[PDB]
UniProtKB/Swiss-Prot annotation:
Monomer. Keywords: Allergen, Antimicrobial, Bacteriolytic enzyme, Disulfide bond, Glycosidase, Hydrolase, Secreted, Signal. GO terms for cellular component: cytoplasm; endoplasmic reticulum; extracellular space. Pfam families: Lys (PF00062). The keyword Signal applies. Lysozymes have primarily a bacteriolytic function; those in tissues and body fluids are associated with the monocyte-macrophage system and enhance the activity of immunoagents. Has bacteriolytic activity against M.luteus. The gene is LYZ. It comes from Gallus gallus. This is Lysozyme C. Its EC number is 3.2.1.17.
Length: 129
């Protein structure tokens, strides 16, 4: 599923991401924009052989199982395929664990490079929330 901007913002809010670990909704929408262009089915292979899945491009090295990432963990206790669902519940739940890991949203390098320090509230402007 490719979400609309405000549609995703609404979904993330309903799932309790607004202000989660102090990150306003616009941060999460921004990160999703640059990680996946709001496409739940986005995947990308990393040089180390891991793969990133879903709207927030969650990595198989630590967070999900895909059966093909040697030496990896599955800390969100999910198949990586659940991160591709039209239902964002698994991605949000796993994102909550990631952003709690110590480095906040710096875990998403695209957030650090493209969202951090910018006017992230622009991403939820106009939305009914």
């Amino acid at each position: 599923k490719v979400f609309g901007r405000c549609e995703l913002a609404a979904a993330m809010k309903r799932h309790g991401l607004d202000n989660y670990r102090g990150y306003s909704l616009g941060n999460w929408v921004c990160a999703a924009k640059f990680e996946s262009n709001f496409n739940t089915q986005a995947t990308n292979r990393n040089t180390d052989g891991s793969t990133d899945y879903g709207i927030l491009q969650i990595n198989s090295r630590w967070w999900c199982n895909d059966g093909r990432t040697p030496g990896s963990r599955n800390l969100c206790n999910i198949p990586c395929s659940a991160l591709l669902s039209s239902d964002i519940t698994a991605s949000v739940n796993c994102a909550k664990k990631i952003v709690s890991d110590g480095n906040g949203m710096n875990a998403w390098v695209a957030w650090r490079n493209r969202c951090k320090g910018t006017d992230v509230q622009a991403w939820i402007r106009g939305c009914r929330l």
